[PDB]
Each structure stands twice: as C-alpha cells, then as structure tokens.
Design an enzyme around this catalytic site. Structure first.
Site, PDB file in Angstrom:
ATOM      1  N   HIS A  90       0.869  -1.232   0.000  1.00 43.52           N
ATOM      2  CA  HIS A  90       0.000   0.000   0.000  1.00 43.52           C
ATOM      3  C   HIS A  90       0.909   1.288   0.000  1.00 43.52           C
ATOM      4  O   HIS A  90       0.288   2.310  -0.309  1.00 43.52           O
ATOM      5  CB  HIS A  90      -1.062  -0.004   1.123  1.00 43.52           C
ATOM      6  CG  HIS A  90      -0.409   0.182   2.459  1.00 43.52           C
ATOM      7  ND1 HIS A  90       0.092  -0.756   3.322  1.00 43.52           N
ATOM      8  CD2 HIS A  90      -0.231   1.374   3.086  1.00 43.52           C
ATOM      9  CE1 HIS A  90       0.509  -0.113   4.402  1.00 43.52           C
ATOM     10  NE2 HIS A  90       0.353   1.184   4.216  1.00 43.52           N
ATOM     11  N   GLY A 114       4.913   0.023   6.253  1.00 39.95           N
ATOM     12  CA  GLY A 114       6.093  -0.465   5.500  1.00 39.95           C
ATOM     13  C   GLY A 114       7.404  -0.727   6.194  1.00 39.95           C
ATOM     14  O   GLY A 114       8.383  -1.347   5.767  1.00 39.95           O
ATOM     15  N   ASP A 130       0.612  -7.677   1.774  1.00 46.71           N
ATOM     16  CA  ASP A 130       1.027  -6.251   1.727  1.00 46.71           C
ATOM     17  C   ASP A 130       2.547  -6.194   1.714  1.00 46.71           C
ATOM     18  O   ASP A 130       3.063  -5.966   2.852  1.00 46.71           O
ATOM     19  CB  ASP A 130       0.254  -5.603   2.917  1.00 46.71           C
ATOM     20  CG  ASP A 130       0.406  -4.102   2.825  1.00 46.71           C
ATOM     21  OD1 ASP A 130       0.909  -3.497   1.857  1.00 46.71           O
ATOM     22  OD2 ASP A 130       0.001  -3.566   3.812  1.00 46.71           O
TER      23      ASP A 130
HETATM   24  C1  LIG Z   1      -6.932   4.673   8.758  1.00 48.06           C
HETATM   25  C2  LIG Z   1      -6.242   3.315   8.456  1.00 48.06           C
HETATM   26  N1  LIG Z   1      -5.048   3.263   7.553  1.00 48.06           N
HETATM   27  C3  LIG Z   1      -4.129   2.233   7.544  1.00 48.06           C
HETATM   28  O1  LIG Z   1      -4.174   1.399   8.404  1.00 48.06           O
HETATM   29  C4  LIG Z   1      -3.026   2.104   6.538  1.00 48.06           C
HETATM   30  C5  LIG Z   1      -3.278   0.875   5.546  1.00 48.06           C
HETATM   31  C6  LIG Z   1      -4.181   1.348   4.442  1.00 48.06           C
HETATM   32  C7  LIG Z   1      -4.907   0.493   3.469  1.00 48.06           C
HETATM   33  C8  LIG Z   1      -6.100   1.219   2.836  1.00 48.06           C
HETATM   34  N2  LIG Z   1      -5.917   1.478   1.335  1.00 48.06           N
HETATM   35  N3  LIG Z   1      -1.733   1.872   7.127  1.00 48.06           N
HETATM   36  C9  LIG Z   1      -1.193   2.279   8.222  1.00 48.06           C
HETATM   37  O2  LIG Z   1      -1.675   3.342   8.586  1.00 48.06           O
HETATM   38  C10 LIG Z   1      -0.238   1.616   9.094  1.00 48.06           C
HETATM   39  F1  LIG Z   1       0.419   2.600   9.650  1.00 48.06           F
HETATM   40  F2  LIG Z   1      -0.900   1.265  10.128  1.00 48.06           F
HETATM   41  F3  LIG Z   1       0.458   0.620   8.771  1.00 48.06           F
HETATM   42  C11 LIG Z   1      -7.299   2.346   7.775  1.00 48.06           C
HETATM   43  O3  LIG Z   1      -7.690   2.676   6.522  1.00 48.06           O
HETATM   44  N4  LIG Z   1      -7.207   1.129   8.160  1.00 48.06           N
HETATM   45  C12 LIG Z   1      -7.910  -0.010   7.819  1.00 48.06           C
HETATM   46  C13 LIG Z   1      -8.605  -0.251   6.643  1.00 48.06           C
HETATM   47  C14 LIG Z   1      -9.367  -1.405   6.400  1.00 48.06           C
HETATM   48  C15 LIG Z   1      -9.400  -2.488   7.287  1.00 48.06           C
HETATM   49  C16 LIG Z   1     -10.196  -3.696   6.819  1.00 48.06           C
HETATM   50  F4  LIG Z   1     -10.659  -3.669   5.620  1.00 48.06           F
HETATM   51  F5  LIG Z   1      -9.437  -4.709   7.055  1.00 48.06           F
HETATM   52  F6  LIG Z   1     -11.306  -4.018   7.363  1.00 48.06           F
HETATM   53  C17 LIG Z   1      -8.616  -2.352   8.432  1.00 48.06           C
HETATM   54  C18 LIG Z   1      -7.922  -1.136   8.681  1.00 48.06           C
END
Ligand SMILES: C[C@H](NC(=O)[C@H](CCCC[NH3+])NC(=O)C(F)(F)F)C(=O)Nc1ccc(C(F)(F)F)cc1
Length: 240
Positions: free
Chosen positions: A45, A189, A93
């Site tokens: 991502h 990451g 990922d």
């Molecule tokens: C705000 C939060 N952002 C995140 O967690 C993003 C990953 C993003 C992928 C989305 N294109 N990453 C991060 O922030 C990290 F710091 F935690 F690693 C969120 O979107 N998290 C999230 C999304 C979906 C699900 C799920 F679909 F699994 F249900 C779980 C958590």
C-alpha cells in the site's frame, strides 16, 4: 509511532524512509528495511500510487542534515502478484524496490536480518516498532526516528472477536494493543524488530491500524509476517 521515545542514531541502521517528490521537495510517506545494498522491503500500500520515490538510508531527523544520509532513487518496483489495494485485510502487503544505486554500509546504514522461512513467534515476544509516523491519532509526523516496545499478540488471541476477528490472517503479526503505544500513518512499510537468539530480525512490515485510531485498546498494529515471504523475496532478488 504513538507512545514512542527517540531512538539513538545507530540504533536501527536498516530503517529507511520512503519519500515521494512533492513538487519542489521530497516528503516522507513510509518506512522500509534495507535488505541488500541495492534492495528495500516496504509495504505494498505504500507504492500504490505512481509517484517519484526516493529512499533515504541512514536517516534520523527528517528536517535536518545529520551528515550521514544516502539519497537513492528507485529504478524498479516489485509488488507482490496478489496484493489487492482494496483488500489490505487479504494480506500480501509487501513490495520490494530495486534502488538506482548500491548504498555504502557503515554503522548508520546496515542490512536488516530476515527470519527463517516459517517462524512464528510466541505470544508476548519483545519487539520494537520504529518510524517517523504520527505520534498521536490525527497528529503529525515525528521529526526524529521513534521507537516503541510492541510485544506480539499471537494469532489465536488476535483473531478473537474481542480483537480483530477474521480481518487478520495467519500471514500477519499483531503487536501491542494496550491503547498507549502503536504504529500510525507514516509508519506503514517499516520494520517490527524482534529479539530472537540474541539478534534483532525484521519480523513485520507495518500494514494497518484501526480506522477509529492508531492506539486502540484490543486493536494491535498489524504487520505482514516476513517469514511467510522468504521464498518470494529470494526469488525476486535472484531474477534481478
Ligand atoms: C486509517 C487506516 N489506515 C491504515 O491502516 C493504513 C493501511 C491502508 C490500506 C487502505 N488502502 N496503514 C497504516 O496506517 C499503518 F500505519 F498502520 F500501517 C485504515 O484505513 N485502516 C484499515 C482499513 C481497512 C481495514 C479492513 F478492511 F481490514 F477491514 C482495516 C484497517
């Protein structure tokens, strides 16, 4: 990192900062782990958007010359065949980046040690989350590299309806969940460093957090378990 302390310069020398060219200058978007003089491991991502990226090895303060940094370009991006943007909950990922040049290793820039393929950590194994990620939920990036003690949560507990449920796969490592300390946007990451056999090995690639916030009680940070991708990592470095 939420609930973190500053790290010392030489502390985690395989830590990288993935930055993108944001007009006139470059901005931090993600962490990564230097795994070859010419290769980086990050989360899939992070390289989803087609931007111009750079890797900074041997970084500490984002905003200040530390007199130890090596700025390298990315000549190829290799993201896992099964990554699906829309489903970070599916796993996979993980992306590998071939750098434009081979870095110089010193006490500040060193290679990250990977686990033995198939290695699973006991519950409450001592691990650390490193990065430049926000320090509070809806917070701002750290200027200096932060570290937090994030001990693992095993897969029976983490896929508890109480915790993440079926959102977490067995190809993921969960760590923290105390509601005080965690990973946050901008840490994505980056390494999760766990003490095994008196050695720090990168056992996670920070994947996601709770939509309600970064440090949520019973929501630990989820990492891509590196030890599940050892044989793909090798195969890509080998054919390049
Ligand atoms: C705000 C939060 N952002 C995140 O967690 C993003 C990953 C993003 C992928 C989305 N294109 N990453 C991060 O922030 C990290 F710091 F935690 F690693 C969120 O979107 N998290 C999230 C999304 C979906 C699900 C799920 F679909 F699994 F249900 C779980 C958590």
């Amino acid at each position: 990192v939420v609930g973190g302390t500053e790290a010392q310069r030489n502390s985690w020398p395989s830590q990288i900062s993935l930055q993108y060219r944001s007009g006139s200058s470059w901005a931090h978007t993600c962490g990564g782990t230097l795994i070859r003089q010419n290769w980086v491991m990050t989360a899939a991502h992070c390289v989803d958007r087609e931007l111009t990226f750079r890797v900074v090895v041997g970084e500490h303060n984002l905003n200040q010359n530390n007199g130890t940094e090596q700025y390298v370009g990315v000549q190829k991006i290799v993201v896992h065949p099964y990554w699906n943007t829309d489903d970070v909950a599916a796993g996979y990922d993980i992306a590998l980046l071939r750098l434009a040049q081979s870095v110089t290793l010193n006490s500040y820039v060193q290679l990250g040690v990977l686990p033995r393929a198939g290695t699973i950590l006991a519950n409450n194994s001592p691990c650390y989350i490193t990065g430049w990620g926000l320090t509070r939920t809806n917070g701002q990036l750290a200027q200096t590299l932060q570290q937090a003690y994030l001990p693992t949560v095993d897969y029976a507990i983490c896929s508890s309806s109480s915790y993440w449920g079926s959102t977490v796969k067995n190809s993921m490592v969960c760590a923290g969940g105390d509601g005080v300390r965690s990973g946050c946007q901008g840490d994505s990451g980056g390494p999760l460093h766990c003490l095994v056999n008196g050695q720090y090995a990168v056992h996670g690639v920070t994947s996601f957090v709770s939509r309600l916030g970064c440090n949520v009680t019973r929501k630990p940070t989820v990492f891509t378990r590196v030890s599940a991708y050892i044989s793909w990592i090798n195969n890509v470095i080998a054919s390049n």
